[PDB]
Amino acid sequence: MQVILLDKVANLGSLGDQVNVKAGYARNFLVPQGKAVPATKKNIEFFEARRAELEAKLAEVLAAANARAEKINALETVTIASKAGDEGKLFGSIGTRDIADAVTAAGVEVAKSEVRLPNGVLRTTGEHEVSFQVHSEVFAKVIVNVVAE
Amino acid sequence: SRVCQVTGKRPVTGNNRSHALNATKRRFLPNLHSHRFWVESEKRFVTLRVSAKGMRVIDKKGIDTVLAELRARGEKY
RNA sequence: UAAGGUGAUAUGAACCGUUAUAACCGGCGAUUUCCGAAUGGGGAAACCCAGUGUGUUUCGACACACUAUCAUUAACUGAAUCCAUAGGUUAAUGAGGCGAACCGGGGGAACUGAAACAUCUAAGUACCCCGAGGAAAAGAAAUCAACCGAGAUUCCCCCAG
RNA sequence: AGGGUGACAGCCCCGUACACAAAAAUGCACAUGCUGUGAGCUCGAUGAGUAGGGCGGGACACGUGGUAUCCUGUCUGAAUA
RNA sequence: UUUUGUAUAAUGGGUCAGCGACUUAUAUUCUGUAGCAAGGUUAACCGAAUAGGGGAGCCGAAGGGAAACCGAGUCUUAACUGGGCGUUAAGUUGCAGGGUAUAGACCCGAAACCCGGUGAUCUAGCCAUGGGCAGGUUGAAGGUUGGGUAACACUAACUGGAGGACCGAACCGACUAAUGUUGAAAAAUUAGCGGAUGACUUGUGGCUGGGGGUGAAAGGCCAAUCAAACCGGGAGAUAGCU
RNA sequence: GUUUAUUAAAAACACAGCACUGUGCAAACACGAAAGUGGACGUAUACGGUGUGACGCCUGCCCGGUGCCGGAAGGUUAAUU
RNA sequence: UGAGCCUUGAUGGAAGUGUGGACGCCAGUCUGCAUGGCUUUAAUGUUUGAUGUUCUAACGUUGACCCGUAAUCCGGGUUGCGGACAGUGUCUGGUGGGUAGUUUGACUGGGGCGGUCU
RNA sequence: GCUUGACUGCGAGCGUGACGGCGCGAGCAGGUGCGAAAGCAGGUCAUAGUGAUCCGGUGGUUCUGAAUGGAAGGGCCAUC
Ligand SMILES: [Mg+2]
Ligand SMILES: [Mg+2]
Ligand SMILES: [Mg+2]
Ligand SMILES: [Mg+2]
Ligand SMILES: [Mg+2]
Ligand SMILES: [Mg+2]
Ligand SMILES: [Mg+2]
Ligand SMILES: [Mg+2]
Ligand SMILES: [Mg+2]
Ligand SMILES: [Mg+2]
Ligand SMILES: [Mg+2]
Ligand SMILES: [Mg+2]
Ligand SMILES: [Mg+2]
Ligand SMILES: [Mg+2]
Ligand SMILES: [Mg+2]
Ligand SMILES: [Mg+2]
Ligand SMILES: [Mg+2]
Ligand SMILES: [Mg+2]
Ligand SMILES: [Mg+2]
Ligand SMILES: [Mg+2]
Ligand SMILES: [Mg+2]
Ligand SMILES: [Mg+2]
Ligand SMILES: [Mg+2]
d(CA A139, CA B34): 65
Specify the resolution in Å.
Answer: 3.2
Residue B62 CA, nucleotide G75 C1', distance (Å): 25
A35 contacts in B (CB within 8 Å)?
none
Counting every residue written for chain A, the total comes to 149
Whether B59 sits inside 8 A of A38 (CB atoms) is yes
H, E, C per residue of chain A: CCCEECCCCCCCCCCCCECCCCCCCCCCCCCCCCCEECCCCCCCCCCCHHHHCCCCCCCCCCCCCCCHHHHCCCCCCCCCCCCCCCCCCCCCCCCHHHHHHHCCCCCCCCCCCCCECCCCCCCCCCCECCECCCCCCCCCCCCECCCCC
Q: Sort A148 into a burial class: Cβ within 10 Å, 0-12 / 13-18 / 19+.
A: middle
H, E, C per residue of chain B: CCCCCCCCCCCCCCECCEHHHECCECCCCCCCCCEECCCCCCCCCCEECCCCCHHHHHCCCCHHHHHHCCCCCCCCC
Whether A1 sits inside 8 A of B59 (CB atoms) is yes
- Name which of A27, A33, A41, A42 to mutate to probe chain B: the one with the most chain B Cβ atoms within 10 A of its Cβ: A27
CATH 3.10.430.100 for domain A69-148:
yes
Per the entry, the structure determination technique was: X-ray
Contact A41, A18 (CB under 8 A): no
Report CA(B25)–ligand 3 centroid distance (Å).
24
